[PDB]
Amino acid sequence: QFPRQCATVEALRSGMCCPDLSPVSGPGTDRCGSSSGRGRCEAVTADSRPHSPQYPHDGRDDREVWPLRFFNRTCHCNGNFSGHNCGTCRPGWRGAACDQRVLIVRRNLLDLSKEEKNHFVRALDMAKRTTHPLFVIATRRSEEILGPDGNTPQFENISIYNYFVWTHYYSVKKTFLGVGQESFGEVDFSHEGPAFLTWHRYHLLRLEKDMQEMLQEPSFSLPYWNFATGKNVCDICTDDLMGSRSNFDSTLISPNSVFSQWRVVCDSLEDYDTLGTLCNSTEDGPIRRNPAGNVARPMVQRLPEPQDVAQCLEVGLFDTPPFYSNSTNSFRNTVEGFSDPTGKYDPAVSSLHNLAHLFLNGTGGQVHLSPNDPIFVLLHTFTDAVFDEWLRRYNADISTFPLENAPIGHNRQYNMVPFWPPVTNTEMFVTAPDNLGYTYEIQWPS
Ligand SMILES: *[C@@H]1O[C@H](CO[C@@H]2O[C@@H](C)[C@@H](O)[C@@H](O)[C@@H]2O)[C@@H](O[C@@H]2O[C@H](CO)[C@@H](O)[C@H](O)[C@H]2NC(C)=O)[C@H](O)[C@H]1NC(C)=O
Ligand SMILES: *[C@@H]1O[C@H](CO)[C@@H](O)[C@H](O)[C@H]1NC(C)=O
Ligand SMILES: *[C@@H]1O[C@H](CO)[C@@H](O)[C@H](O)[C@H]1NC(C)=O
Ligand SMILES: *[C@@H]1O[C@H](CO)[C@@H](O)[C@H](O)[C@H]1NC(C)=O
Ligand SMILES: *[C@@H]1O[C@H](CO)[C@@H](O)[C@H](O)[C@H]1NC(C)=O
Ligand SMILES: N[C@@H](Cn1ccc(=O)c(O)c1)C(=O)O
Numbered sequence: 001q002f003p004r005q006c007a008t009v010e011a012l013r014s015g016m017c018c019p020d021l022s023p024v025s026g027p028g029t030d031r032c033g034s035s036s037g038r039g040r041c042e043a044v045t046a047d048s049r050p051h052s053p054q055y056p057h058d059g060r061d062d063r064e065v066w067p068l069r070f071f072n073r074t075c076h077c078n079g080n081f082s083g084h085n086c087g088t089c090r091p092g093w094r095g096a097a098c099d100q101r102v103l104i105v106r107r108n109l110l111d112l113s114k115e116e117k118n119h120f121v122r123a124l125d126m127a128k129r130t131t132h133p134l135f136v137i138a139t140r141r142s143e144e145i146l147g148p149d150g151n152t153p154q155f156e157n158i159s160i161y162n163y164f165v166w167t168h169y170y171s172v173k174k175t176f177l178g179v180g181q182e183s184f185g186e187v188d189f190s191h192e193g194p195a196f197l198t199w200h201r202y203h204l205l206r207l208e209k210d211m212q213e214m215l216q217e218p219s220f221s222l223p224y225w226n227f228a229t230g231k232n233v234c235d236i237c238t239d240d241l242m243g244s245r246s247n248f249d250s251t252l253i254s255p256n257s258v259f260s261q262w263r264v265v266c267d268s269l270e271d272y273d274t275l276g277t278l279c280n281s282t283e284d285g286p287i288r289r290n291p292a293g294n295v296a297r298p299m300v301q302r303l304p305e306p307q308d309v310a311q312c313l314e315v316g317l318f319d320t321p322p323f324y325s326n327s328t329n330s331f332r333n334t335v336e337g338f339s340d341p342t343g344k345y346d347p348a349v350s351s352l353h354n355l356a357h358l359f360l361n362g363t364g365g366q367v368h369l370s371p372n373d374p375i376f377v378l379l380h381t382f383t384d385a386v387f388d389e390w391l392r393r394y395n396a397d398i399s400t401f402p403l404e405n406a407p408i409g410h411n412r413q414y415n416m417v418p419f420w421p422p423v424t425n426t427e428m429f430v431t432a433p434d435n436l437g438y439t440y441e442i443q444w445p446s
């Protein structure tokens, strides 16, 4: 979403989000750090290819051709510099000149020392309560973004972790068609299409980086949850990790865990989809969670089996037509969970990543809310670990990731909504250890 210095009347009217870095001659003198060698303001590269006919409302939705409905000028950073104003480094690099390589290791949450488990839980809690130093979130769509008097940008500060929740919400929300009109819901810029794995990869990378700067710990890494154990239970739902079941309410988190104190954002869909507003930073109810608790649906009362992971890593084409939730023999769709681990599509199956979500029977099972439950982080670093092993094994074969006719948001060169600066799926479609400064300490079934 947008840097606070671009969430201004001047910046939105200009269409330029190219903030200063260290201006020593007055405002606008070091845009993108162009005084040093760090970058320059330039025109936005956005995808103009066609999308699937599934979305019929071209011209109605601020997320189309991201980010041109807000800005047509951005920073492009030189070399291994990065960031909204080219003041930081690309993933895997540090130092004033972005020339010292780092490689952080993402580990199984269960393998961490007692002090590392407690350090991770507290870091997450700190992110829930700490204002994001860079990004603010829109509470209204572009037509109303400048406020009633036209001079009051409709943005709020938001914590580090709630920003992580908000961008996921924004990527899946419905297209508002107007008061009286029913919002359009056959659209999802981060699921049910090829961009699912690259989108969620950046999502994790952005939270990880934000927590490193919040902690001043360059090497801090996000753990993962191996949910492919075939278990009846959630083995990370203990009070030293993520929280156990409350004994006073089967659907709440134990009061002995800090997560029972969390209050969710973005749980007012009926307001957003009838008044055309957006999720803001005001929190509401508690996390609801009830592992295996969906008696109405026995298929989602057990977690994937270890053999589900091995099977899906044998699917060698990243994605297949129609590049949607009903694709067959698509690794993307298999690991996402709409096909079975062998690639066979079945409207009645949920497996792997989808199954782990549904197994929570709660806040984590609803796509517009699920990052509110911090299991989401661990569930998706695991999905990313699977994705990374695929990248290794099939040599990052981006060839079946379609350039056009995907569901909207999912063309290969689409800028992943709503990340800032603009970042394509392509930039994420690389093996992490050589290209993104992280790797997984994990071994696969065989
Ligand atoms: C690049 O953007 C400028 C600024 O326009 C804004 O960009 C988007 C947020 C979009 O929502 C526009 O409505 C915003 O106005 C464009 O310059 C303006 O263009 C509009 C009509 O397009 C015109 O009425 C204004 O007079 C222009 N204002 C200024 C300060 O020039 C510019 O045309 C865009 N260039 C592109 C898209 O190639
Ligand atoms: C954002 O937070 C700043 C402090 O970082 C505070 O001064 C202000 O209330 C907020 N500004 C906007 C535009 O939301
Ligand atoms: C934030 O969202 C809630 C729920 O829709 C809403 O009632 C409230 O008015 C919103 N706040 C702002 C400032 O729009
Ligand atoms: C949880 O499962 C029950 C049935 O056992 C179902 O009625 C309810 O909708 C589910 N809730 C969520 C959030 O999945
Ligand atoms: C997948 O779903 C779309 C939209 O419902 C449909 O047009 C397409 O034919 C489906 N493909 C299948 C079921 O193979
Ligand atoms: N919608 C999916 C389940 N699901 C729920 C929450 C999510 O975040 C997600 O990514 C997927 C399904 O129908 O199986």
Ligand SMILES: [Zn+2]
Pocket (backbone or CB within 6 Å): 042, 076
């Ligand atoms: Zn350039």
Ligand SMILES: [Zn+2]
Pocket (backbone or CB within 6 Å): 168, 190, 191, 200
């Ligand atoms: Zn998701």
Ligand SMILES: [Zn+2]
Pocket (backbone or CB within 6 Å): 353, 357, 380
């Ligand atoms: Zn998910």
